[PDB]
Enzyme design. Structure first.
Site, PDB file in Angstrom:
ATOM      1  N   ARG A 177      -1.027  -2.265 -15.323  1.00 25.28           N
ATOM      2  CA  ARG A 177      -0.090  -2.290 -16.437  1.00 25.28           C
ATOM      3  C   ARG A 177      -0.651  -1.402 -17.536  1.00 25.28           C
ATOM      4  O   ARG A 177      -1.140  -1.888 -18.553  1.00 25.28           O
ATOM      5  CB  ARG A 177       0.084  -3.719 -16.970  1.00 25.28           C
ATOM      6  CG  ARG A 177       0.950  -4.636 -16.101  1.00 25.28           C
ATOM      7  CD  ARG A 177       0.664  -6.097 -16.391  1.00 25.28           C
ATOM      8  NE  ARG A 177      -0.502  -6.539 -15.642  1.00 25.28           N
ATOM      9  CZ  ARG A 177      -1.586  -7.051 -16.190  1.00 25.28           C
ATOM     10  NH1 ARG A 177      -1.666  -7.186 -17.509  1.00 25.28           N
ATOM     11  NH2 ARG A 177      -2.594  -7.415 -15.419  1.00 25.28           N
ATOM     12  N   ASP A 242      -7.805  -8.957 -11.756  1.00 26.48           N
ATOM     13  CA  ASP A 242      -6.380  -8.932 -12.096  1.00 26.48           C
ATOM     14  C   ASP A 242      -5.384  -9.462 -11.064  1.00 26.48           C
ATOM     15  O   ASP A 242      -4.275  -8.928 -10.948  1.00 26.48           O
ATOM     16  CB  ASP A 242      -5.954  -7.511 -12.474  1.00 26.48           C
ATOM     17  CG  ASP A 242      -4.632  -7.490 -13.224  1.00 26.48           C
ATOM     18  OD1 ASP A 242      -3.644  -6.886 -12.721  1.00 26.48           O
ATOM     19  OD2 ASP A 242      -4.589  -8.077 -14.333  1.00 26.48           O
ATOM     20  N   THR A 243      -5.766 -10.491 -10.310  1.00 23.95           N
ATOM     21  CA  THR A 243      -4.860 -11.072  -9.335  1.00 23.95           C
ATOM     22  C   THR A 243      -4.689 -12.542  -9.663  1.00 23.95           C
ATOM     23  O   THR A 243      -3.656 -12.937 -10.194  1.00 23.95           O
ATOM     24  CB  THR A 243      -5.386 -10.940  -7.907  1.00 23.95           C
ATOM     25  OG1 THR A 243      -6.616 -11.661  -7.772  1.00 23.95           O
ATOM     26  CG2 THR A 243      -5.591  -9.495  -7.570  1.00 23.95           C
ATOM     27  N   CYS A 348      -3.960  -9.498   2.628  1.00 22.02           N
ATOM     28  CA  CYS A 348      -5.052  -9.825   1.696  1.00 22.02           C
ATOM     29  C   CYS A 348      -6.261 -10.566   2.254  1.00 22.02           C
ATOM     30  O   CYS A 348      -6.129 -11.648   2.820  1.00 22.02           O
ATOM     31  CB  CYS A 348      -4.522 -10.616   0.493  1.00 22.02           C
ATOM     32  SG  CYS A 348      -5.737 -10.888  -0.857  1.00 22.02           S
ATOM     33  N   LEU A 349      -7.445  -9.989   2.054  1.00 23.88           N
ATOM     34  CA  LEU A 349      -8.667 -10.605   2.541  1.00 23.88           C
ATOM     35  C   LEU A 349      -9.233 -11.588   1.539  1.00 23.88           C
ATOM     36  O   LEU A 349     -10.138 -12.357   1.844  1.00 23.88           O
ATOM     37  CB  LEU A 349      -9.698  -9.525   2.877  1.00 23.88           C
ATOM     38  CG  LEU A 349      -9.338  -8.666   4.089  1.00 23.88           C
ATOM     39  CD1 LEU A 349     -10.175  -7.425   4.104  1.00 23.88           C
ATOM     40  CD2 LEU A 349      -9.537  -9.459   5.358  1.00 23.88           C
ATOM     41  N   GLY A 350      -8.686 -11.575   0.340  1.00 26.20           N
ATOM     42  CA  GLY A 350      -9.165 -12.490  -0.682  1.00 26.20           C
ATOM     43  C   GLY A 350      -8.339 -13.762  -0.822  1.00 26.20           C
ATOM     44  O   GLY A 350      -8.726 -14.696  -1.512  1.00 26.20           O
TER      45      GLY A 350
HETATM   46  C1  HEM Z   1      -3.391 -14.593  -6.045  1.00 25.47           C
HETATM   47  C2  HEM Z   1      -4.182 -13.406  -5.826  1.00 25.47           C
HETATM   48  C3  HEM Z   1      -3.976 -12.326  -4.960  1.00 25.47           C
HETATM   49  C4  HEM Z   1      -2.833 -11.738  -4.532  1.00 25.47           C
HETATM   50  C5  HEM Z   1      -1.416 -12.213  -4.749  1.00 25.47           C
HETATM   51  C6  HEM Z   1      -3.252 -10.646  -3.664  1.00 25.47           C
HETATM   52  C7  HEM Z   1      -2.406  -9.718  -3.084  1.00 25.47           C
HETATM   53  C8  HEM Z   1      -2.756  -8.762  -2.183  1.00 25.47           C
HETATM   54  C9  HEM Z   1      -1.811  -7.936  -1.467  1.00 25.47           C
HETATM   55  C10 HEM Z   1      -0.298  -8.034  -1.540  1.00 25.47           C
HETATM   56  C11 HEM Z   1      -2.519  -7.071  -0.685  1.00 25.47           C
HETATM   57  C12 HEM Z   1      -1.963  -5.961   0.203  1.00 25.47           C
HETATM   58  C13 HEM Z   1      -1.336  -4.811  -0.560  1.00 25.47           C
HETATM   59  C14 HEM Z   1      -0.865  -3.693   0.336  1.00 25.47           C
HETATM   60  O1  HEM Z   1      -0.166  -3.971   1.328  1.00 25.47           O
HETATM   61  O2  HEM Z   1      -1.186  -2.531   0.035  1.00 25.47           O
HETATM   62  C15 HEM Z   1      -3.927  -7.404  -0.916  1.00 25.47           C
HETATM   63  C16 HEM Z   1      -4.987  -6.695  -0.378  1.00 25.47           C
HETATM   64  C17 HEM Z   1      -6.311  -7.003  -0.561  1.00 25.47           C
HETATM   65  N1  HEM Z   1      -6.768  -7.998  -1.386  1.00 25.47           N
HETATM   66 FE1  HEM Z   1      -5.726  -9.258  -2.559  1.00 25.47          FE
HETATM   67  N2  HEM Z   1      -4.629 -10.576  -3.542  1.00 25.47           N
HETATM   68  C18 HEM Z   1      -5.075 -11.616  -4.303  1.00 25.47           C
HETATM   69  C19 HEM Z   1      -6.419 -11.822  -4.567  1.00 25.47           C
HETATM   70  C20 HEM Z   1      -7.489 -11.099  -4.078  1.00 25.47           C
HETATM   71  C21 HEM Z   1      -8.892 -11.333  -4.470  1.00 25.47           C
HETATM   72  C22 HEM Z   1      -9.367 -12.407  -5.444  1.00 25.47           C
HETATM   73  C23 HEM Z   1      -9.658 -10.392  -3.754  1.00 25.47           C
HETATM   74  C24 HEM Z   1     -11.050 -10.233  -3.623  1.00 25.47           C
HETATM   75  C25 HEM Z   1     -12.028 -10.524  -4.624  1.00 25.47           C
HETATM   76  C26 HEM Z   1      -8.668  -9.577  -3.019  1.00 25.47           C
HETATM   77  C27 HEM Z   1      -9.013  -8.592  -2.097  1.00 25.47           C
HETATM   78  C28 HEM Z   1      -8.144  -7.881  -1.293  1.00 25.47           C
HETATM   79  C29 HEM Z   1      -8.555  -6.817  -0.389  1.00 25.47           C
HETATM   80  C30 HEM Z   1      -9.959  -6.373  -0.009  1.00 25.47           C
HETATM   81  C31 HEM Z   1      -7.422  -6.280   0.078  1.00 25.47           C
HETATM   82  C32 HEM Z   1      -7.308  -5.059   1.001  1.00 25.47           C
HETATM   83  C33 HEM Z   1      -7.023  -5.319   2.467  1.00 25.47           C
HETATM   84  C34 HEM Z   1      -6.619  -4.069   3.214  1.00 25.47           C
HETATM   85  O3  HEM Z   1      -6.521  -3.003   2.572  1.00 25.47           O
HETATM   86  O4  HEM Z   1      -6.380  -4.146   4.438  1.00 25.47           O
HETATM   87  N3  HEM Z   1      -7.361 -10.015  -3.243  1.00 25.47           N
HETATM   88  N4  HEM Z   1      -4.058  -8.458  -1.832  1.00 25.47           N
HETATM   89  C1  LIG Z   2      -1.985  -3.489  -4.503  1.00 25.84           C
HETATM   90  N1  LIG Z   2      -3.058  -4.400  -4.817  1.00 25.84           N
HETATM   91  C2  LIG Z   2      -2.869  -5.751  -4.300  1.00 25.84           C
HETATM   92  C3  LIG Z   2      -3.880  -6.622  -5.096  1.00 25.84           C
HETATM   93  C4  LIG Z   2      -4.351  -5.714  -6.254  1.00 25.84           C
HETATM   94  C5  LIG Z   2      -3.376  -4.515  -6.237  1.00 25.84           C
HETATM   95  C6  LIG Z   2      -4.003  -3.268  -6.851  1.00 25.84           C
HETATM   96  C7  LIG Z   2      -3.712  -2.867  -8.155  1.00 25.84           C
HETATM   97  C8  LIG Z   2      -4.401  -1.812  -8.737  1.00 25.84           C
HETATM   98  C9  LIG Z   2      -5.391  -1.179  -7.996  1.00 25.84           C
HETATM   99  N2  LIG Z   2      -5.675  -1.542  -6.742  1.00 25.84           N
HETATM  100  C10 LIG Z   2      -5.006  -2.567  -6.190  1.00 25.84           C
END
Ligand code: HEM
Ligand SMILES: CN1CCC[C@H]1c1cccnc1
EC number: 1.14.15.1
Length: 407
Positions: A177, A242-243, A348-350
């Site tokens: 943002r 920021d999630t 998402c891995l988180g």
């Molecule tokens: C409520 C919180 C969260 C939401 C809603 C969320 C959402 C997402 C989404 C939608 C994606 C895939 C985006 C795409 O298709 O390009 C993603 C990817 C990922 N998230 Fe999150 N996330 C959350 C929290 C976290 C946290 C806390 C971490 C780690 C500290 C994290 C680590 C990752 C990683 C490593 C990926 C990449 C996986 C890949 O590229 O295959 N996320 N997340």
């Molecule tokens: C697309 N992603 C899913 C979780 C975080 C978000 C994001 C936003 C800005 C930079 N990298 C990743």
């Protein structure tokens, strides 16, 4: 303003939606985005805002595009075009087969195994913060709990000092943002500028922290490079900062306005896990997409190579054709459907860390401060972007209705 309409775009599919400042924003950010789902709007539209980009408005379309990485590439996943072109975090900016190998390594620092082992510390941090607020009878939830709880948990796991939070938090926000002071490329590099010296020092003298594990990690047997570690660590920073921070605000806002639903949890604690899933559906907050790798006809719409296509993870669960009464929060919903954590090879891995954090918050807050609400005469303003959030959430409660619990 608006970008001139491309030759191949039909005028009847133009809906000038602005993802960074939707027209119906005051009604609630999820409500603003839902306008794309009203009866008259097609399944796939084109907005002239932010340089111009397509927008799939329904779950069926969104889920399809995310699975088809051959036609829809993550190489330039953000709106506007300059931000997506400059974005190179790993694994988000890669498509299979290349991206697969990097997921396993990331799982080594945020996967279920690590999460299981963080449970005690997570609950311990949640309780101290809450009890710290309980006696005051008020708080601005965004800065008093939503930001500190998740960010400190991450800064810890990452071996990064807490005094660095304000700087890092600001930089990550310019990516989701932007307030206009920084381009996407500038914020990204500022983040890299911060991480580079650290990844180098952790490769010389590695610790047990998240960055040490990544910098000295191996993907498919070969050792990861310094550049790759940087790109992977930058993604982890955004996730921890920021999630969940934004999600908790949407969730507590709703709870503040529905003494009914909170009472449902206080009285029947076992449904908090299920409640979390429903809150994740109703208040989904991420919206990124993909870029066309070739001329492709998708659901009768002619798309040309290089066209960007936003596929809002937040829309699938709000789609009436996926959940009967979309804007209603029903903790007892039998098939809570959504794509809040993404779909396809980039799931998402988180999310596991995310769920424990959301669930711990609900259980430890409701147990101490069951009665609370929105401050006197305050109107809650939401913020839109790649990751939507809540500008401010001031709450109030009578100390006499709270109870000091011992962790
Ligand atoms: C409520 C919180 C969260 C939401 C809603 C969320 C959402 C997402 C989404 C939608 C994606 C895939 C985006 C795409 O298709 O390009 C993603 C990817 C990922 N998230 Fe999150 N996330 C959350 C929290 C976290 C946290 C806390 C971490 C780690 C500290 C994290 C680590 C990752 C990683 C490593 C990926 C990449 C996986 C890949 O590229 O295959 N996320 N997340
Ligand atoms: C697309 N992603 C899913 C979780 C975080 C978000 C994001 C936003 C800005 C930079 N990298 C990743």
């Amino acid at each position: 303003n608006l970008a001139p309409l491309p030759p191949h775009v039909p005028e009847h599919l133009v809906f000038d939606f602005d993802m960074y400042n939707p027209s119906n924003l005051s009604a609630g950010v999820q409500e603003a985005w839902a306008v794309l789902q009203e009866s008259n709007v097609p399944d796939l539209v084109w907005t002239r805002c932010n340089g111009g980009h397509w927008i799939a408005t329904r779950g069926q379309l969104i889920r399809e595009a995310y699975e088809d990485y051959r036609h829809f590439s993550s190489e330039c996943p953000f709106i506007p075009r300059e931000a997506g072109e400059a974005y190179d975090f790993i694994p988000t900016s890669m498509d299979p087969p290349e991206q697969r190998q990097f997921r396993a390594l990331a799982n080594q620092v945020v996967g279920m195994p690590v999460v299981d082992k963080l449970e005690n510390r997570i609950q311990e941090l949640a309780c101290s913060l809450i009890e710290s607020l309980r006696p005051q009878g008020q708080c601005n939830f965004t800065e008093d709990y939503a930001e500190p709880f998740p960010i400190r948990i991450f800064m810890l796991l990452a071996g990064l000092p807490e005094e660095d939070i304000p700087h890092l938090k600001y930089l990550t926000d310019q990516m989701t943002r932007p307030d206009g002071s920084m381009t996407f490329a500038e914020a990204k590099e500022a983040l890299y500028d911060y991480l580079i010296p650290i990844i180098e020092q952790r490769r010389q003298k590695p610790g047990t922290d998240a960055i040490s594990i990544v910098a000295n990690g191996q993907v498919n047997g070969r050792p990861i490079t310094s550049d790759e570690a940087k790109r992977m660590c930058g993604l982890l920073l955004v996730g921890g900062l920021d999630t969940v921070v934004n999600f908790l605000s949407f969730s507590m806002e709703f709870l503040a306005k529905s003494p009914e639903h909170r009472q449902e949890l206080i009285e029947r604690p076992e449904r908090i896990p299920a409640a979390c899933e429903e809150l994740l559906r109703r208040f989904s907050l991420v919206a990124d997409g993909r870029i066309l790798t070739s001329d492709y006809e998708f659901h009768g719409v002619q798309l040309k190579k290089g066209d960007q296509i936003l596929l809002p993870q937040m829309l699938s669960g709000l789609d009436e054709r996926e959940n009967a009464c979309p804007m209603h929060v029903d903790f007892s919903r039998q098939k809570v459907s959504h794509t809040t954590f993404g779909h396809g090879s980039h799931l998402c891995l988180g999310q596991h860390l995310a769920r424990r954090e959301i669930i711990v918050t609900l259980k430890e807050w409701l147990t101490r401060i069951p009665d609370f609400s929105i401050a006197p005469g305050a109107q809650i303003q939401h913020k839109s972007g790649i990751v939507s959030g809540v500008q401010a959430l001031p709450l109030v409660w009578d100390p006499a209705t709270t109870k000091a619990v011992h962790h």
